[PDB]
Amino acid sequence: LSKVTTVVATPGQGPDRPQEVSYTDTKVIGNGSFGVVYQAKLCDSGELVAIKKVLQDKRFKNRELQIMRKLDHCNIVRLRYFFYSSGEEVYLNLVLDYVPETVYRVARHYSRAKQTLPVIYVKLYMYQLFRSLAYIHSFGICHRDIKPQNLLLDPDTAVLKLCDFGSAKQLVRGEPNVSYICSRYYRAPELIFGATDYTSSIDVWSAGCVLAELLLGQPIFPGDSGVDQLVEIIKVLGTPTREQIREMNPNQIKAHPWTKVFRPRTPPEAIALCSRLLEYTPTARLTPLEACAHSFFDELRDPNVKLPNGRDTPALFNFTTQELSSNPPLATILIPPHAR
Numbered sequence: 278l279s280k281v282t283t284v285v286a287t288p289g290q291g292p293d294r295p296q297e298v299s300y301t302d303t304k305v306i307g308n309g310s311f312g313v314v315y316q317a318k319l320c321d322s323g324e325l326v327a328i329k330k331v332l333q334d335k336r337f338k339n340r341e342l343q344i345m346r347k348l349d350h351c352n353i354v355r356l357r358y359f360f361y362s363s364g365e366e367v368y369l370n371l372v373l374d375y376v377p378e379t380v381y382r383v384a385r386h387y388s389r390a391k392q393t394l395p396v397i398y399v400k401l402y403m404y405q406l407f408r409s410l411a412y413i414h415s416f417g418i419c420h421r422d423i424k425p426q427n428l429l430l431d432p433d434t435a436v437l438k439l440c441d442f443g444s445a446k447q448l449v450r451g452e453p454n455v456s457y458i459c460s461r462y463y464r465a466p467e468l469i470f471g472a473t474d475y476t477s478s479i480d481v482w483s484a485g486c487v488l489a490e491l492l493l494g495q496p497i498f499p500g501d502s503g504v505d506q507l508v509e510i511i512k513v514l515g516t517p518t519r520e521q522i523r524e525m526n527p528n529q530i531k532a533h534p535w536t537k538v539f540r541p542r543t544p545p546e547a548i549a550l551c552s553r554l555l556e557y558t559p560t561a562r563l564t565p566l567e568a569c570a571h572s573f574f575d576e577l578r579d580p581n582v583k584l585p586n587g588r589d590t591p592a593l594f595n596f597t598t599q600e601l602s603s604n605p606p607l608a609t610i611l612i613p614p615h616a617r
């Protein structure tokens with residue numbers, strides 16, 4: 278609150294050269310499995326920041342911090358600084374970009390009010406999620422907890438930022454990974470099947486679940502348990518052929534038309550995008566970069582596009598080489614003539 282805290286914090290991206298950082302108006306805003314999250318105001322600039330505090334084992338490196346020190350993207354909450362603090366024990370503190378809203382909260386307001394999120398926002402929010410994934414997947418980093426709670430929004434600018442890398446991991450082919458991750462509703466089928474050799478494509482399934490959820494006003498796959506979740510998917514997508522099961526798993530509903538799950542007025546390209554994300558076969562799913570280049574997002578590339586409030590859209594085309602690395606020719610679609 279009124280107390281001024283001064284710490285010696287290390288720049289998130291820069292050289293390892295610690296600075297004194299003073300912050301104030303400190304309040305907890307989240308306290309869960311993720312740790313404790315604080316809102317605070319930087320003394321010098323008057324800028325709000327979030328501070329994530331997690332217990333550290335000290336005999337071990339923090340994975341989340343390793344990942345965050347690598348990332349610099351407009352659709353990912355930035356690590357401004359990190360520092361350590363003591364109790365008695367030892368905590369690591371991530372000083373992060375503050376973002377006021379979440380997709381969860383926003384979808385819930387619309388749902389509660391019996392309304393749907395306007396399609397322009399669905400395009401904006403989904404696109405920026407895919408850019409963020411294209412970016413992190415380019416390092417072989419899989420978020421592994423893509424869900425509406427982890428999508429932060431600035432409603433005034435329509436900026437979406439991916440947050441919570443506490444479940445993120447660099448996926449190395451041949452190194453086994455845990456299957457019971459992601460939030461249930463958003464959890465890929467291969468995970469429910471127990472695959473330990475999964476790829477970044479689990480994030481893409483999750484994004485599809487988010488997109489489907491923004492279109493419907495409720496989770497598309499609301500599993501009752503970790504096991505009932507597979508049933509919920511089958512109910513919507515129909516039984517996987519044995520070929521698909523082989524694709525998902527290292528060891529009786531039919532095809533349910535995609536244009537009937539959603540409401541009658543849902544844009545067909547949104548349904549078409551959805552169908553390419555929610556494929557049983559992990560490698561059949563679009564890459565995030567491919568998802569960005571999908572027709573559903575064409576309006577975002579229209580030179581006349583504006584937010585509902587008249588403002589320009591936020592950064593949409595400032596693609597780096599790193600972001601483009603999975604399919605560089607896609608730059609021809611992604612970056613429209615006027616943006617060059």
Ligand SMILES: COc1ccc(CSc2nnc(-c3ccc4c(c3)OCO4)o2)cc1F
Nearest residue numbers: 306307311314327354373374375376440441
């Ligand atoms: C406020 O909503 C939450 C969302 C996710 C989490 C999980 S851990 C985390 N990692 N970065 C964050 C983070 C970064 C910037 C933020 C933020 C949270 O809230 C406002 O600006 O939170 C905790 C939360 F409390």
